[PDB]
């Protein structure tokens, strides 16, 4: 075990020092590398279990069993006296900077995973480049550094969700004694977009400052992997060149799909365009039923829009369908219209967008319902949210040999390695993994540590918690009820559930029995919690802490013995007792 | 072992059936019992792993070894043939109601713990009485069934906190694009109090309905334990009488203290008076620094009041003091004034309360600082929040033999038993236990199950999480940092921490580095999490789920391997890395 690890670590690290904590000679070398501003990894052997087995194996590289020992890109450099010789003769800088490649690491893609990987690698002395380019949308929309979440995803969508939530805060304030009249207050779309975009701009700037402060080279250029170690780059003037790298991380993400129907690309938009749109959408049709579709429809309706959602089959395919139906029912009762069992056939243009006066155009949507009946209605804006896909044919020469699956995503090992040994993939393009920003960040940071600091920890992709930020939010961790029943059988599954009412909703005269939670449990395994589900306000804050308990294998008895915090929504999980099998009502 | 449990279970259960799940003669008895509306406990011997031994020890009571066996108040009643004989001869009803005492259980006190205990006991056939009486405050305030939390505690205080939080929602709404002008909106105290009190009234009514529906006798009378089984009751007409009970549960709670200074009782008020006050307090002095003091000062200032807090020594004594200082700093930066190191000497009346025009009076407060300098200022209302105390000399004759500690609270075993074998105590009067509503509820329900249904589960009072609902909320679970260091020594303690900014605060232009969290860990026990602390919005929702993980022994590694939910405040707990010993700044 120890030998294949130490070999892999020395071969991969850019600059690494084997040390001990009590070591005064080691202190001498650390102080020299610090003064020289040479970054490096450090492996303190006195804090590792097999530290003695390792110390003796280092001599197969250096012929000494003593500490400190410093290596650079696989080569032993010397002990304390020797390193000070190089430092004294001004030979050290040339030694630590000698490499077969331009960079130790090239990251293709500057989003959630790629920026995290690149910054973490540079901390251990890896010479790193991050490449980012944003292909414009069909109407020409583009944006800065940071990826999908930062510019056209989690960040602007939750800010517009908060704008919508504040509509009910205004309604509630009257009941709690404040003197405003909600009916006389309106919303200004362009004022919201300006504030959201100013925040996004601060994040674009922050990432560029962060890369420079970590000595990471940022290239605003499109990358193409043409051989295992060669990346062809095309810059903003279409100047083409080639850079070389030891390790490669692919982190290029996905973009929205369009349906293959007339007028879709020409006259519709996607979430890529929505978050910087310079006019209010007006009367809007959202086509699709993913979490993107429902999140966007929800805040547009709370901001005063006339909103319709067109649903081919079900809502939130892949999520617990009891919960998905509750999500949709709340939306329908609070101002969102649904066109059910329906698809589009054609989008026709009736008026062009008025870019001078900041007004939408007008469109005619023709479609049909699943029995055969026809759909025909006019909308000012049509938004497609029908899935996302990678486009690695742009990024990856087939001759390189990186295997993809039938969806176009990269087939990886459990340590993110592709079928080419020095090439790795992280984030949304890694086949079979949850497509979420904190997953991409953890994968990128953990991989960087394995490549350049001798770490062994892997990313754990199981039981990753989620939240859908619909008008009433939905948090989940673990299996849906139907997946648990399929895996283990109905007689081995027990479900505890309850409605609840937030205390904040009492004086505000909101609904008694719409919020809801359940625990899906396995009888034959000590009533283990397989899945947790909650529909209610602040659902992401509620859910997050329980994800640690589920990671540790919580049972129903662990929830029972823990005491609630009063008054909160979350405490209802600590006293659940009504089972679905019992048939007793869950109402409050 | 087994036989001590069986004798205790048979002796104290009111009506109990020993059974097996596959037992047609057991089903025959079950069907007769609740056709006759006879409530009872049931123990299914095949569900227990020593049921074979239990079934044999039953013969020491009944001289038979089969199931079913039915018992009433310690007496074997019969097997299947015998119970059916009593039924068809119309003898069963009188048998199940034979008792040495008027009640199987008398609960003294109708609050959080007492209502929970009484309702649970009745489920198993215990004939139960709940006594509740509310001694009026010095100015005459009184209220209905449900205890301190429902009427003058958690429920109205969090509703008034919400009214305060909505002030910032009105401010934020402009930045998110809404057309209102916060500076032209004012608050109406009396409108808010009316809505709060209408909800409280619905809870008073709901508890009376619940007790009637469970066949619990509710007496609105003051109780006094005059011997181990006799309770003297005084009703609202001063009619005095005596009732007897087998088991007694003391659940009488606490009331606010007043300082022994001139004018305090005559001219000041407490939290008992605040939540139904018919006029706005106006310019207010809060004397004290408990969570009650700071929560009340905080919402009064958010509702537009001129508020000062007079602090004898420190804020939130007994809570982590770094967190307490940050709580106070936020309040002082957001409109609360503090008179530090200061105590009151006298309250003098300048104007009587105007009960016609519905206006406060006016008071002169004289006090002094610890260095001897004088304090003198005028206020419309003075609120005392200087602790709470029981008054069991009003409930408990000294000759009964129930032992009290130096603070007047009841000394109990770990199963709530007092020094008198049939008398138990729960809730705030149980010495040494956290004084919280969910603790009192769990203790009451678990005790009723042990008395009348043969349960063995004890209440676990360790690592109970808390939240202080100040203008910026403070949630906690486990040890303070200073208690951890005192117990294990500084070299064995590692603290990870970070500032954070809620995404909702970005477009609203709120503060960058005020919200804060830390994990207090033990190095020599695998970095076990000894305490968790968070200052931020929705802190109670954030904290609750982590209480389950801490109950199961979470380590720092467990937090690290769990993935965050983005974008949330809570996710910052999943990526903490800055230690206090590194000296690295926690700002973000
Ligand atoms: C509307 C929406 C809302 C979302 N909300 C949430 C949410 O609330 N929570 C959550 O956890 N996740 C959310 N997500 C998902 C989250 O955005 C993604 O999981 C995450 O951004 C994926 O990170 P990544 O590093 O894999 O790719 P990305 O963040 O997409 O970054 C890849 C980058 O590489 C660039 N690139 C592509 N090809 C090349 C090339 N050849 N050369 C150079 N650069 C290239 C791309 O333009 C992009 O900038 C949301 C997604 C969407 C669309
Ligand atoms: C301002 C304030 C805010 C609080 N906020 C919170 C919070 O957010 N969260 C939380 O968990 N806890 C909170 N608490 C604490 C919570 O109120 C108590 O822990 C809880 O009410 C204790 O329940 P109990 O059954 O022990 O007593 P109580 O609820 O006080 O009930 C005792 C009852 O018995 C009655 N009684 C007394 N003597 C007799 C007698 N001789 N005969 C008959 N009846 C009698 C009393 O009048 C009262 O109705 C708060 C307390 C205060 C004061
Ligand atoms: O047969 C197809 N399904 C159809 S039309 N519908 C299902 C959804 O509800 C409306 C009708 C099909 C083939 C290509 C696209 O659709
Ligand atoms: O995906 C790959 N899996 C394999 S076989 N391994 C990693 C290297 O050796 C140990 C196992 C891979 C390796 C080289 C190119 O692709
Ligand atoms: O021992 C206590 N209670 C009583 S009366 N018993 C328990 C043990 O079994 C015999 C009866 C007690 C209560 C508070 C401190 O000690």
Q: Which residues pair with B369 in a beta bridge?
A: B342
β-strands A528-535, A474-478 pairing: antiparallel
Q: In this complex, do A185 and B172 lie within 8 Å of one another by their Cβ atoms?
A: no
Residues 6+ apart with CB under 8 A from A575: A560, A564
Closest atom, ligand 1, to C-alpha of A395: 41
Main-chain dihedrals φ then ψ at residue A35, nearest 5 degrees: -55, -40
Alpha-carbon A79 to chain mean position: 43
Is residue A105 helix, strand or coil? Answer: strand
Q: Which residues pair with A493 in a beta bridge?
A: A522
Q: Under a CB-based contact definition with an 8 Å cutoff, are residues B223 and B81 in contact?
A: no
- Find chain A residues with C-beta within 8 A of B509's C-beta: none
Q: Ligand 1 — pocket residues by CB below 6 A?
A: A 108-114, 131-134, 147-149, 153-154, 157, 222-223, 251-253, 271, 292, 394-395, 427-428, 435-438, 440; B 566
Distance CA A259, CA A431 (A): 23
Q: Under a CB-based contact definition with an 8 Å cutoff, are residues A324 and A287 in contact?
A: no
B412 lines ligand 5 (CB under 6 A): yes
| A-to-B residue pairs, Cβ atoms closer than 8 angstroms | 245
Distances from the Cα of B176 to the Cαs of A167, B471, B542, in angstroms? 10, 21, 25
A420 lines ligand 4 (CB under 6 A): yes
Closest atom, ligand 2, to C-alpha of B223: 42
Could you say which ligand is closest to the alpha carbon of residue A422?
A: 4
To the question of whether residue B295 is assigned a binding role by annotation, the answer is: yes
Q: Under a CB-based contact definition with an 8 Å cutoff, are residues A283 and A312 in contact?
A: no
Can you give A40-84 as a three-state secondary structure string? CEEEEHHHCCCHHHHHHHCHHHHCCCCCCEEEECCEEEECHHHHH
Structure tokens, A336 = 């969102």
Distance CA A436, CA A430 (A): 11
Residue in A343, A345, A366 to alter for ligand 3 test, most ligand atoms within 8 A of Cβ: A343
DSSP state of B271: H
Q: In this complex, do A565 and B467 lie within 8 Å of one another by their Cβ atoms?
A: yes
Is residue B351 helix, strand or coil? Answer: strand
Tell me which of A177, A179, A187, A526 to substitute to probe the interface with B (most B C-beta atoms closer than 10 Å). A177
Alpha-carbon A250 to chain mean position: 15
Can you give B157-216 as a three-state secondary structure string? HHHHHHHHHHHHHHHHHHHCCECCCHHHCCECHHHHHHHHHHHHHHHHHHHHHHHHHCCC
Q: How many CA atoms lie within 13 A of A144 on its CB side?
A: 12
Q: Under a CB-based contact definition with an 8 Å cutoff, are residues B132 and B218 in contact?
A: yes
CA of B94 relative to ligand 2 center, distance in Å: 38
Distance CA A302, CA A308 (A): 13
β-strands B69-72, B103-108 pairing: unpaired
Distance CA B222, CA B154 (A): 24
Strand ranges (DSSP E) for A370-492? 374-379, 381-384, 388-389, 423-425, 466-468, 474-478
Could you say which ligand is closest to the alpha carbon of residue B137?
A: 2
A170 lines ligand 3 (CB under 6 A): no
Q: Give the Cβ contact number of residue B160 at 10 Å.
A: 27
Alpha-carbon A285 to chain mean position: 27
B147 lines ligand 2 (CB under 6 A): yes
Q: Which domains does chain B have, with CATH numbers?
A: 2-96 (3.40.30.10), 103-161+190-256+389-452 (3.50.50.60), 264-386 (3.50.50.60), 473-574 (3.30.390.30)
β-strands B222-227, B230-234 pairing: antiparallel
B108 lines ligand 2 (CB under 6 A): yes
Distance CA B213, CA B221 (A): 20
Method by which the coordinates were obtained: X-ray
Residue ranges in B36-146 assigned as alpha helix (H): 51-57, 59-62, 80-88, 92-96, 112-123
To the question of whether residue B317 is assigned a binding role by annotation, the answer is: yes
Is residue B428 helix, strand or coil? Answer: helix
Q: Under a CB-based contact definition with an 8 Å cutoff, are residues B1 and B28 in contact?
A: no
Helix axes A437-452, A112-122, angle to 10 degrees: 30
Closest atom, ligand 3, to C-alpha of A313: 8
Tell me which of A162, A174, A176 to substitute to probe the interface with B (most B C-beta atoms closer than 10 Å). A176
Q: Give the Cβ contact number of residue A22 at 10 Å.
A: 9
Structure tokens, B20 = 């097996």
Q: In this complex, do B163 and A177 lie within 8 Å of one another by their Cβ atoms?
A: yes
Helix axes B80-88, B24-35, angle to 10 degrees: 30
**Between the CA atoms of A430, A431, A434 and A439, what dihedral angle is there, to the nearest 10 degrees?**
-20
Q: Please provide the distance, in angstroms rounded to a whole number, between the alpha carbons at the two ends of chain A.
A: 58
Q: Give the Cβ contact number of residue B563 at 10 Å.
A: 29
Q: In this complex, do A176 and B188 lie within 8 Å of one another by their Cβ atoms?
A: no
Residue of A nearest to B195 (CA): A507
Distance CA A511, CA A515 (A): 8
Q: How far is A451 from chain B (nearest CA, A)?
A: 19
Is residue B153 helix, strand or coil? Answer: coil
Whether B566 is a known active-site residue: answer yes
Residue in B228, B417, B429 to alter for ligand 5 test, most ligand atoms within 8 A of Cβ: B417
Q: Which residues pair with B515 in a beta bridge?
A: B500
Distance CA A517, CA A536 (A): 8
Residues 6+ apart with CB under 8 A from B454: B5, B9, B13, B16, B41, B43
Q: Under a CB-based contact definition with an 8 Å cutoff, are residues B303 and B187 in contact?
A: yes
Distance CA A458, CA A506 (A): 46
CA of B361 relative to ligand 3 center, distance in Å: 74
Going by CA atoms, what residue is nearest to atom 6 of ligand 5? B421
Strand ranges (DSSP E) for A211-313? 217-219, 222-227, 230-234, 240-250, 255-256, 284-287, 307-311
Q: Under a CB-based contact definition with an 8 Å cutoff, are residues B286 and B293 in contact?
A: yes
Look at residues A105, A471, A427, A502 and name the one whose alpha carbon lies nearest to residue A301.
Answer: A471
| Strand order across the beta sheet in which A41-44 lies | A41-44, A15-19, A69-72, A75-78
A370 lines ligand 3 (CB under 6 A): yes
Specify the DSSP element, H or E, that contains A494.
strand A493-500
DSSP state of A374: E
Phi-psi region of A403 (alpha: psi -120 to 50; beta: other; left: phi over 0): beta
Distances from the Cα of B539 to the Cαs of A201, A565, B546, in angstroms? 29, 10, 12
Specify the DSSP element, H or E, that contains B376.
strand B374-379
Rg (CA), chain B: 28
CA of A115 relative to ligand 1 center, distance in Å: 11
- Find chain B residues with C-beta within 8 A of A438's C-beta: 563-566, 571, 574
Please name the residue that has the structure tokens 């009367």. Answer: A283
Look at residues B17, A69, A139, A430 and name the one whose alpha carbon lies nearest to residue A443.
Answer: A430
Annotated binding residues of A: 20, 55, 67, 80-81, 112-114, 132-133, 148-149, 154, 157-158, 222-223, 225, 252, 255, 288-295, 312-313, 317, 387, 391, 397, 428, 435, 437, 483, 509, 560, 562, 566, 574
β-strands B474-478, B284-287 pairing: unpaired
Distances from the Cα of A273 to the Cαs of A47, A135, A148, B404, B499, in angstroms? 52, 13, 12, 70, 33
DSSP state of A417: B
Distances from the Cα of A396 to the Cαs of A86, A128, A207, A226, B299, in angstroms? 42, 20, 26, 7, 59
Q: In this complex, do A569 and B545 lie within 8 Å of one another by their Cβ atoms?
A: no
Structure tokens, B197 = 């009190």
Distance CA A35, CA B7 (A): 78
A516-520 contacts: CB < 8 A, separation 24 or more? A516/A323, A516/A326, A516/A586, A517/A572, A517/A573, A517/A576, A518/A481, A519/A495, A519/A556, A519/A559, A519/A573, A519/A576, A520/A478, A520/A479, A520/A480, A520/A481, A520/A484, A520/A493, A520/A495
Residues 6+ apart with CB under 8 A from B262: B346, B347
Look at residues A63, A144, A71, A69 and name the one whose alpha carbon lies nearest to residue A111.
Answer: A144
Structure tokens, A71 = 């290596």
Structure tokens, A238 = 């279409």
Q: Under a CB-based contact definition with an 8 Å cutoff, are residues B246 and B12 in contact?
A: yes
Q: In this complex, do B554 and A548 lie within 8 Å of one another by their Cβ atoms?
A: yes
Distance CA B335, CA A228 (A): 62
Main-chain dihedrals φ then ψ at residue A204, nearest 5 degrees: -55, -50
Going by CA atoms, what residue is nearest to atom 1 of ligand 3? A370
My answer on whether omega of the bond before A231 falls inside 30° of 0, hence cis, is no
Q: Under a CB-based contact definition with an 8 Å cutoff, are residues B36 and B87 in contact?
A: yes
Distance CA B492, CA B512 (A): 32
Distance CA A413, CA A411 (A): 7
Tell me which of B156, B161, B176 to substitute to probe the interface with A (most A C-beta atoms closer than 10 Å). B176
Can you give B487-504 as a three-state secondary structure string? HHCHHHEEEEEEEECCCH
Distance CA B588, CA B576 (A): 11
């Amino acid at each position: 075990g120890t030998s294949q690890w130490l070999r892999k670590t020395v071969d991969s690290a850019a600059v690494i020092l084997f040390s001990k904590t009590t070591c005064p000679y080691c202190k001498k070398v650390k102080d020299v590398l610090a003064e020289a501003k040479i970054k490096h990894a450090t492996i303190e052997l006195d804090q590792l279990s097999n530290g003695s087995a390792i110390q003796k194996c280092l001599a197969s590289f250096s012929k000494i069993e003593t500490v400190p020992q410093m290596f650079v890109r696989g080569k032993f450099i010397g002990d304390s006296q020797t390193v000070l010789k190089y430092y004294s003769n001004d030979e050290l800088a040339g030694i630590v900077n000698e490499s077969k490649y331009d960079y130790d690491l090239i990251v293709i893609g500057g989003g959630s995973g790629g920026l995290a990987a690149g910054k973490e690698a540079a901390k251990y002395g890896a010479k790193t480049a991050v490449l980012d380019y944003v292909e414009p949308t069909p109407i020409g929309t583009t944006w800065g550094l940071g990826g999908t979440c930062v510019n056209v995803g989690c960040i602007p969508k939750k800010l517009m969700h908060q704008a919508g939530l504040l509509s009910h805060a205004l309604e509630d304030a009257e009941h709690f004694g404040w003197s405003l009249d909600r009916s006389k207050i309106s919303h200004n779309w362009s004022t919201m977009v300006e504030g959201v975009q100013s925040h996004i701009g601060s994040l674009n700037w922050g990432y560029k400052v962060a890369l420079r402060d970590n000595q990471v080279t940022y290239l605003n250029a499109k990358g193409r992997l043409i051989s295992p170690h060669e990346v062809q780059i095309t810059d903003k003037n279409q100047k083409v060149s080639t850079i070389t790298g030891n390790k490669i991380i692919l982190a290029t993400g996905e973009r929205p799909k369009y349906p293959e129907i007339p007028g879709a690309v020409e006259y519709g938009i996607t979430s890529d365009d929505l978050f910087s749109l310079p006019y209010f959408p007006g009367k809007t049709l959202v086509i699709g039923a993913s979490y993107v579709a429902l999140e966007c429809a929800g805040f547009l309706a709370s901001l005063g829009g006339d909103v319709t959602v067109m649903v081919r089959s079900i809502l939130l395919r892949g999520f617990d369908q009891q919960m998905a139906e509750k999500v949709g029912d709340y939306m329908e009762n609070h101002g969102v219209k649904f066109a059910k069992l329906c698809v589009p056939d054609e989008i026709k243009q009736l008026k062009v967008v008025d870019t001078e006066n900041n007004k939408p155009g007008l469109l005619l949507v023709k479609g049909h319902y699943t029995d055969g009946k026809k759909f025909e209605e006019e909308f000012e804006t049509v938004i497609f949210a029908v899935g996302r896909e990678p486009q690695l044919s742009k990024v990856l020469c087939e001759t390189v040999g990186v295997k993809l699956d039938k969806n176009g995503r990269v087939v990886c090992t459990d340590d993110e390695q592709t079928t080419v040994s020095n090439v790795y993939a992280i984030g949304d393009i890694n086949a079979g993994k949850p497509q979420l920003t904190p997953v991409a960040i953890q994968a990128g940071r953990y991989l960087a540590r394995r490549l350049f600091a001798g770490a062994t920890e892997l990313t754990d992709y199981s039981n990753v918690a989620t939240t859908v930020f619909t008008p009433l939010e939905y948090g989940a961790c673990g299996l849906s009820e139907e997946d648990a029943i399929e895996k283990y059988g109905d007689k081995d599954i027990e479900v505890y559930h309850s409605n609840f009412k937030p205390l904040e909703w009492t004086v505000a005269h909101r609904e008694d029995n719409v919020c809801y939670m359940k625990l899906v449990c396995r009888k034959s395994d000590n009533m283990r919690v397989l899945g947790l589900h909650v529909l209610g306000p602040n659902a992401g804050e509620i859910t997050q802490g329980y994800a640690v308990a589920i990671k540790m294998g919580a049972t129903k008895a662990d929830f029972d013995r823990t005491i609630g915090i009063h008054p909160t929504c979350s405490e209802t999980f600590t006293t659940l007792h009504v089972t679905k099998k019992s048939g007793v009502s869950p109402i409050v």
